[PDB]
Amino acid sequence: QFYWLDLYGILGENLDIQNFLPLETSKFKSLSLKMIKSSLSTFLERQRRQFPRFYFLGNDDLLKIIGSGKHHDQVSKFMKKMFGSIESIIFFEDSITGVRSVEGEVLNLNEKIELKDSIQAQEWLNILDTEIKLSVFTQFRDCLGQLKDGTDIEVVVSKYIFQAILLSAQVMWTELVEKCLQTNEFSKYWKEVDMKIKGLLDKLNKSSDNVKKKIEALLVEYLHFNNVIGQLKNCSTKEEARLLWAKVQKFYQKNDTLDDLNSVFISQSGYLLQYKFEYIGIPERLIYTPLLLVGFATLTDSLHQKYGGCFFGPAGTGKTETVKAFGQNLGRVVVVFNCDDSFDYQVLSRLLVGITQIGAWGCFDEFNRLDEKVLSAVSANIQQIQNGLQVGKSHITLLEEETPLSPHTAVFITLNPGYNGRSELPENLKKSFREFSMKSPQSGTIAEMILQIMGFEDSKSLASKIVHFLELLSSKCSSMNHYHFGLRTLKGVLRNCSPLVSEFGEGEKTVVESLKRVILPSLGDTDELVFKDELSKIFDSNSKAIVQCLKDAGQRSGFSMSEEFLKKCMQFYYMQKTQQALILVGKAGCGKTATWKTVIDAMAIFDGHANVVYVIDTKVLTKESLYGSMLKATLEWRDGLFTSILRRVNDDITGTFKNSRIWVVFDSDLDPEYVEAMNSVLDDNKILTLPNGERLPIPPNFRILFETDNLDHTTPATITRCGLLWFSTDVCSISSKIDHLLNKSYEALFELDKLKDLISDSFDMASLTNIFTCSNDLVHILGVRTFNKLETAVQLAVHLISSYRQWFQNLDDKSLKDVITLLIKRSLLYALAGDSTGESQRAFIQTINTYFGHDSQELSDYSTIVILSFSSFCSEIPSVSLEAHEVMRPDIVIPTIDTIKHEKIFYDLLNSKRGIILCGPPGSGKTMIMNNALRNSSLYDVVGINFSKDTTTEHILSALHRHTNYVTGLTLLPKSDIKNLVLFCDQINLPKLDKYGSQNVVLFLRQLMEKQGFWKTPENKWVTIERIHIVGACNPPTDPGRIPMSERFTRHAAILYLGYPSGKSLSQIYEIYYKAIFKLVPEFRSYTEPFARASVHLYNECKARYSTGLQSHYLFSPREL
Amino acid sequence: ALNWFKNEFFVDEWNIADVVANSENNYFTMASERDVDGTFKLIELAKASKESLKIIPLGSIENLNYAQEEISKSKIEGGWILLQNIQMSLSWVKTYLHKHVEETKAAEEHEKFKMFMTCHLTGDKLPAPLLQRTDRVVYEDIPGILDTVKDLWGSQGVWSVYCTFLLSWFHALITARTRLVPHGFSKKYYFNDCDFQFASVYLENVLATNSTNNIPWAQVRDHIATIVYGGKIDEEKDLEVVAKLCAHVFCGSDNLQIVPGVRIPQPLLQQSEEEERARLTAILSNTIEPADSLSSWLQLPRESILDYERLQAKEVASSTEQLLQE
Amino acid sequence: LETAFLERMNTLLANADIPDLFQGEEYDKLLNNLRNKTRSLGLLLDTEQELYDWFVGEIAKNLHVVF
Ligand SMILES: Nc1ncnc2c1ncn2[C@@H]1O[C@H](COP(=O)(O)OP(=O)(O)OP(=O)(O)O)[C@@H](O)[C@H]1O
Ligand SMILES: Nc1ncnc2c1ncn2[C@@H]1O[C@H](COP(=O)(O)OP(=O)(O)OP(=O)(O)O)[C@@H](O)[C@H]1O
Ligand SMILES: Nc1ncnc2c1ncn2[C@@H]1O[C@H](COP(=O)(O)OP(=O)(O)OP(=O)(O)O)[C@@H](O)[C@H]1O
């Protein structure tokens, strides 16, 4: 009944919209419902025209707001998106008595707004906008009246909203400083403002939350006042005083006019700006510095002539917050967009239409991320808006529609030049903007003022020491990419000092603890030593519960809690308290996943909150699948995976997310063309901006994790926003990892317990240490570190030993020890030296036999166990008798010992459910050997894919279309319920690298292996894989055109090297072939040997003589034979 | 030494207005390097010609379709149409514009049509068949200091004209300084007509509210150094150079030695605006830019500009010798 | 004209079929056609696996490609 009820509430029970929607009204009456609902976009655009702020609501949001005009519940819920500064509407007696800001401030209206069912949302919302403007002005008027009369500052702050008190204080400060400027008497007024600062600072310690926030912001403003007043007091001449005073912002009121809302204006450098009296709430105020003031000056100069403002410079200097603070100072709130390459001409044009009609100020962040084409195209619209404002036009034409021009708008752009993934503005677009450099903020003043606000005993000394220490670290640490000690790091430190004030006592101890927590987790060993020594040089000087939670979580999950592992867990736990965005960088297999899962589980134990975690592979997904896409053909927005998750969390239909944490893990390489889209999500804006116009807030408990192994192509724009955790080395020893793997393999399985004891005794680290040490010296083709090869050893050994459980009950102790020893030796051999050549494998067998002890069961080249007794493959090779025609068959394999060994080990590995990669020269028999191994099986079907340069995830998924079914998360199963599927990947390493050095298809295969599932993009659902295995083959990564594959993939698969057969082997095989053929002419069968010899000799001499150094296509292999 | 040849033999030289005004063509291609754009030259031209110039940037299908329609209209009814950054849409330059221009090679039947195209000399290749039909003009800065100030002055109550004259000198001097990339400013920068225009606006705004002749010269210096021109400057050394030049020019002295040649006295408030403009123009036109103006007028070490100037002369002379041998 | 052409001809010679040409209802139709042809040839193939195996085998038998 859902769809009819939805469209009935939307379209059915409404006889006013039929004058614009007569077709849909009649069509609904007859009733397809979905298509009618998608046909209402024209009316939605009509409704947007009647209230410009509606451009920040999606189509569904407009449908809801239009429908529920009889309740006025839903309209409140959109205030955060429509106005930004307002959280909700305060209703009473079917009328509005006030509004509630984001910070919790309540604004009362001068007159209650009576509501009716017949009055549409746009109508009384326009009334509300006028009423909010009038109420803010009224409180400003009354507060200025009281302050000018002589009322004390401390007895007015508790009566009025922040804006009224701020602007009254500013106007009085301007007037009084100008009167002081009339003469040389500045000492008395400096003392007066100092006393006011002291009074407010003392009152701060005795305050409620809202009063606390108001007093903090007022203290910021009065510290700026005092600094300015002191500077003017210390000028030499009158001209110096006038020169200094002309450069700061002055707050004047037109007390001689009739227009109330336009009575206040701002003077700076001879130019005047109009104060708007828009409600902004109680935002965090920026400490005033010379750079901030000069930025305000440049923005004022640009706005005088209606030119677009522009700030450029390196990342982390406070450009966007400078723009926002400028807007706040002018009594208005700036709408912030996050530009991306998903924007095009239509998106920017629509956003400009919205900003035009609203009368809002818009700031475009990361403007360089727009591609060149749209940067060229939108210059016409930029020029038209500028010309319209300068001339005084009443309408402008955008996207073929004439729309009104609200004479309050402004366009600002923030751009970071010279960064990866950024572009360059064309000249005819730059000429429409006034650029200003923001290269270096005055961090010392910021630190000093913030510390003074926090109430620290000595702000000057601590500010000096912190800033000097950060400079020393930036000067002394090694040359590494992820070292940034600029303003964002300073803010992280100072913010972390806040919760620790009562822990240490408003002194140096808090500062040093904050420095440690912020900086140490991101440093290496050398830089850790430098940090600790320097911190000791410059500065003079109980976690038991969370530690025990971590211990419990680790032991229950089964990971050894080593000292390094616990250290990293503790650092992560303290970092995630205040950082909503963390990056974990370490080598493949070092234990990042263990670290963050363990810490979240410990937090779940400690707090009792639920934890829902989503794992997204950024590179495998395209951007239009991750962040969603607008279909321009229908103008219909459809969410991506990340956008869908955020929307669902914000909706919170059942309230399930009120007592839980949401974790989003990006398990792939950082890519500046993906992660930068979330810049405004990660930084203080905490907002996701979509191209369609929506603005999705980020909940306070919504944290994002990035997991990768490099920071090569990542720019400072992301590194300086996210807290960074650096893993120098593996979190545990080889013994601990073997213990974990053995416990997990056993638990996955009386008899098994004694067998567990036997196996654990067999895995004696005393000899395995030396075996690994001398394994490290071999040549590994497409190799992997020893630390990431242990998994194959343990898994295969456990599988092999458990396969013989049926015959252990009747064995003596010596027999059991011998079988276990031989199986473990063979598994260790193939795990460590499987990717080496034959001679290397035999020497490694020799070393294994040496180190396990002379008195242990010996492993040999072709040793095996038969149904128990020990034997060898060399005695178990049957002969083959072919008929002549059977030489034409593709599925004939002449048996031989090396073939049997390869087939046996491959099949054993496959049974253990370990992914397999075959590697060897072309023609060595990889696909043949695979095919022969599974041809005679009854457990597996085979599906083959041929990979190439331009294959994608789509080809691999389409290859399984006729073999698999989707069965309701969702599951993907083989169609047959008796055999599994083995999906063999031929030439896995050919698919080329993208512009940043990644293989999306190989990452997709990694996701299939590791997570046993993937994300279905059109529906944004999780698909679990049950009975599909992944194997593949490639040539070595030295032949032309082959792409080396990252360790993060290959660590999940055993690697077997397959070289060419020896000369005698080829001679015997092809002698057998010629013997089969000569049955046609048996009178020449005496020549079977010399013909085979001639063929093999000719092959060898052609291969040696005609190399690829002559022609690229001179490749010779047994295929020719 | 290089200018010797040009001055001795050649007795005339054309500008953009000369080329457009005296041409049988009606399609014009302008080219420049990065961060140099002559769109304002075309708008000044069109205003001087009392022509309606419509400017369309290319790079998107919407602007392209609108451009096709407006090209048709501008060729049937008349009017000037400008297509910016044609290299951005070569697949349309090489297909649509290529065919149409040949068609207008044929019609030559409407007198009030002119099409202008801009492109970058450092960008991609435009098709030769289209390139060799339209007229071609290269836009670049005026090399001489006195020439630059003369042009700026020619493009344009006594205090207003006096401050404009000083600003013209300042703009010429700073633009000349930008040539010495390793000696003048630490980093390469560009200055254009918008900086001059904003400086003029600020100077007029200051003059509007200082009727006492107590000109706040310190405010003028700080604003011009820091905001109008300093906004582009991201280095302390270069900003100090700018501050030095501002202190030299806008000092407010009774008679400024703006260069080792002309001295500029302050105006008399008893004189008319036309009188003071005539006096300033006479002061400008009566002087001579010396051979070593790169040093004396910019106060640079001679040995520093020597490498710059000599290497330019070396390249020019070497190319001339190679061409003459062949 | 495009590298995609190569991406097709590679598959077509690495394996008999091009799976992208016979997805969804195109697959269903293919199977139906195969069934009809099978009945017309006096062969008994019941499942989609048998039909598709016969299809790819005949393709490998009959089609020759000359570059
Ligand atoms: N005057 C100030 N007082 C206090 N903190 C400030 C001040 N100016 C900037 N900050 C701090 O600087 C950071 C704001 O930087 P912002 O987000 O604007 O960077 P950005 O230049 O836009 O970055 P990017 O190039 O990475 O996009 C916040 O930490 C803010 O607290
Ligand atoms: N404390 C520990 N004790 C035992 N084994 C551990 C411990 N920590 C990690 N391991 C093992 O080490 C490996 C750690 O890999 P993990 O799953 O954490 O991914 P990773 O190192 O982040 O790699 P990738 O980025 O490739 O996914 C796993 O085999 C895990 O079993
Ligand atoms: N008994 C045998 N042992 C080994 N090779 C044999 C035997 N009988 C025939 N051969 C030949 O060995 C070659 C097997 O190589 P195959 O064609 O399977 O290569 P591949 O592993 O798929 O190679 P690539 O990586 O280039 O795709 C074929 O020429 C096959 O004819």
DSSP secondary structure, A773-806, as one string: HHHTTS--TT---GGGTHHHHHHHHHHHHHHTGG
**Strand, helix or coil at A455?**
coil
List C-alpha distances in Å: A485 to A286, A445, A523, B204.
Answer: 20, 16, 12, 44
* Cα–Cα dist B7/B4, whole Å: 5
At A237, list the tokens.
């001449």
Q: Report d(CA A951, CA A699) in Å as an integer.
A: 39
Residue A764 CA to residue B312 CA, distance in Å, equals 78
* Positions of E strands within A645-690: 660-667, 687-689
Count Cβ neighbours within 10 Å for each residue of A446-479 and write b for 16 or more, e otherwise. Answer: bbbbbbbbbebeebeebbebbbebbebbeeebee
Nearest to A906 by CA among A984, A998, A822, A963: A984
Q: Which residue in the set C3, C24, C48 is minimally distant from A949, CB to CB?
A: C3
Ligand nearest to the CA of A891: 3
Q: Which token pair is A707? A: 């997991």
Give the β-pairing of A980-986 and A395-398. unpaired
Measured between its terminal Cα atoms, the distance across chain A in Å is: 70
Give bridge partners of residue B265 from the DSSP assignment.
B255
Helix, strand, coil in percent for chain C, rounding step 5: 70, 0, 30
What residues pair up with B116 in beta bridges, in sequence order? B28, B82
The one-letter code for the residue type at A419 is Y
Considering Cα of B211, then B213, then B214, then B218, what sign does the dihedral take? Answer: positive
Count of C-beta atoms within a 10 Å radius of residue C15: 18
Closest to A1001 measured CA to CA, from A1019, A1013, A989, A1016: A989
Of chain B, the end-to-end C-alpha distance in Å amounts to 23
Half-sphere exposure of A436 (CA within 13 A, CB side): 32
State the nearest Cα–Cα gap between C20 and chain A, in angstroms.
7
Token pair of B128 as six digits: 């030769």
Q: Position A918: which residue type? A: L
SS3 A49: helix
Q: What are phi and psi of B153, to 5 degrees?
A: -65, -40
A 10 A CB-CB count for A654 gives 7
CA of A593 to the centre of ligand 2 (A): 6
Rounded CA gap, A440 and A463, in Å?
Answer: 17
Q: Where are the beta strands (DSSP E) in B33-161?
A: 53-57, 79-84, 113-120, 135-138
**Ligand that lies nearest to the alpha carbon of residue A285, given by its number in the listed order:** 1
**Which residues are B19's β-sheet partners?**
none
Q: How far apart are CA A877 and CA A1064, in angstroms?
A: 16
Q: Determine which helix (DSSP H) or strand (DSSP E) holds B242, and give its type and residue range.
A: helix B236-249
* Pairing status of strand A970-974 against strand A687-689: unpaired
Q: Which residue has the tokens 């030494």?
A: B1
Q: Evaluate whether A336 touches A280 at the Cβ level (below 8 Å).
A: no
**What residue in A sits closest to B37 (Cα-Cα)?**
A427
Please tell me if the CB atom of residue A683 comes closer than 6 angstroms to any atom of ligand 1: yes
How many angstroms from the chain centroid is the CA of residue A200? 42
Query: Which sign, positive or negative, has the C-alpha torsion A90, A96, A102, A105?
Result: negative
What spatial distance separates the first Cα and last Cα of chain C, rounded to whole Å?
15
Q: Is A946 helix (H, G, I), strand (E, B) or coil?
A: strand
Alpha-carbon gap, residue A186 to A179, rounded angstroms: 10
Compute the distance between CA of residue A167 and CA of residue A626 in angstroms, rounded to an integer.
44
Q: What is the DSSP string of A491-510?
A: HHHHHHHTTTHHHHTSSHHH
User: What's the gap in Å between the CA of B264 and the closest CA on chain A?
Assistant: 25
The encoded tokens of residue A639 equal 């969410």
Q: Which residues line ligand 3 (CB under 6 A)?
A: A 893-894, 896, 899, 922-928, 1033, 1035, 1061, 1069, 1118-1119
Contact A131, A109 (CB under 8 A): yes
The one-letter amino acid code at B219 reads: Q
Is A1001 in contact with A952 (CB distance < 8 Å)?
yes
**Are the CB atoms for A452 and A220 separated by under 8 Å?**
no
Cβ contact B138:B31 at 8 Å: yes
Using CA atoms, how far apart are residues A938 and A916, in angstroms rounded to an integer?
19
CA of A502 to the centre of ligand 3 (A): 74
Q: Are A425 and A372 in contact (CB under 8 A)?
A: no
Q: Which of A593, A600, A1048, when mutated, tests ligand 2's pocket best, judged by the most ligand atoms within 8 Å of its CB? A: A593
The letter for the amino acid at A246 is A
Within 6 A (CB) of ligand 2 lie: A 559-560, 562, 565, 588-594, 707, 731-732, 736-737, 740, 1048
Report how far residue A1017's alpha carbon sits from residue A666's, in angstroms, rounded to the nearest whole number.
16
By CA distance, what is A991's nearest residue in C?
Answer: C7
The DSSP bridge partners found for residue A108 are A98
Which amino acid is it at A609? Answer: H
Q: Which residues in chain A are closer than 8 Å to C52, comparing Cβ atoms?
A: 962
| CB burial readout A850-877, b (16+ within 10 A) else e | ebbeeebbbbeebbbbeeeeeeebeeee
Nearest of A923, A906, A883, A915 to residue A1119 by alpha carbon: A923
Amino acid of residue B37: D
How many residues are recorded in chain B?
326
**Token pair for A183:** 């003469």
Residues 6+ apart with CB under 8 A from A1058: A902, A918, A919, A920, A924, A925, A926, A929
Q: Please judge whether A380 and B194 are an interchain contact, meaning their C-beta atoms are less than 8 angstroms apart.
A: no
Q: Helix, strand, or coil here: B229?
A: coil
| Yes or no, beta carbons of A377 and B62 under 8 Å apart | yes
Q: Which amino acid is residue A734, in one-letter code?
A: I
Q: CB under 8 Å, gap of 24 or more: what pairs does C16-25 form? A: C16/C56, C16/C57, C16/C59, C16/C60, C17/C52, C17/C55, C17/C56, C17/C59, C19/A955, C19/A958, C19/A959, C19/A961, C19/A962, C20/A954, C20/A955, C20/A958, C23/A958, C23/A961, C24/A961
Count CB-CB contacts under 10 A for residue B325.
6
Question: A99: part of which helix (H) or strand (E)?
Answer: strand A95-101
Provide the 3-class DSSP secondary structure of residue A899.
Answer: helix
Tell me the backbone φ, ψ of residue A577, rounded to 5 degrees: -60, -45
Smallest CA-to-CA distance from B289 within B270, B262, B307, B313 is with B262
Name the nearest CA neighbour of B290 among B152, B142, B146.
B146
Confirm if B206 and B216 have CB atoms less than 8 A apart. yes
Residue A450's Cβ-side half-sphere holds a number of Cα atoms within 13 Å equal to 27
Tokens found for residue B267: 């105006």
DSSP per position, A524-562: -HHHHHHHHHHHHHHS----HHHHHHHHHHHHHHT----
Distance CA B1, CA B5 (A): 8
Q: Which long-range contacts (CB under 8 A, 24 or more apart) does A799-806 make?
A: A799/A745, A799/A908, A799/A911, A799/A912, A799/A913, A800/A826, A800/A827, A800/A908, A800/A912, A801/A755, A801/A759, A802/A749, A802/A755, A803/A911, A804/A865, A804/A868, A805/A751, A805/A752, A805/A755
> A545-550: long-range contacts at Cβ-Cβ below 8 A with a sequence spacing of 24 or more?
A545/A606, A546/A570, A546/A573, A546/A602, A546/A606, A549/A602, A549/A603, A549/A605, A549/A606, A550/A598, A550/A599, A550/A602
What whole-number distance in Å separates Cα of residue B258 and Cα of residue B174?
A: 13
Task: Please report, for residues A185, A339, A909, A989, A1051, the alpha-carbon distance to residue A1033 in angstroms, rounded to integers and kept in the order given.
Answer: 87, 42, 15, 9, 15
DSSP label at residue B230: G
Taking CB atoms and an 8 Å cutoff, what residues of chain A touch C19? 955, 958-959, 961-962
**Do A and C touch (≥3 CB pairs < 8 Å)?**
yes
Q: Are A426 and A375 in contact (CB under 8 A)?
A: yes
Q: Which two tokens stand for residue A762?
A: 């067999």
Residue A284: closest CA among A739, A684, A13, A826: A684
Tokens of A304: 């005088």
Residues in chain A with CB shorter than 8 Å from the CB of B56 are 380
Please indicate whether, in this complex, the C-beta atoms of C4 and A950 are within 8 angstroms of each other: yes
Method for this entry? cryo-EM
Measured in whole angstroms, the distance separating CA A482 from the mean position of its chain's CA atoms is: 17
Query: d(Cα A438, Cα A1019) in Å, to the nearest integer?
Result: 44
Contacts of A1043 (CB under 8 A, 6+ apart): A989, A990, A991, A992, A993, A999, A1037
Q: Please report which ligand is nearest the Cα atom of A680.
A: 1
Per the CB < 8 A criterion, the answer to whether B54 and B77 are in contact is: no
What CA–CA distance (Å, rounded) separates A1038 from A1015?
A: 34
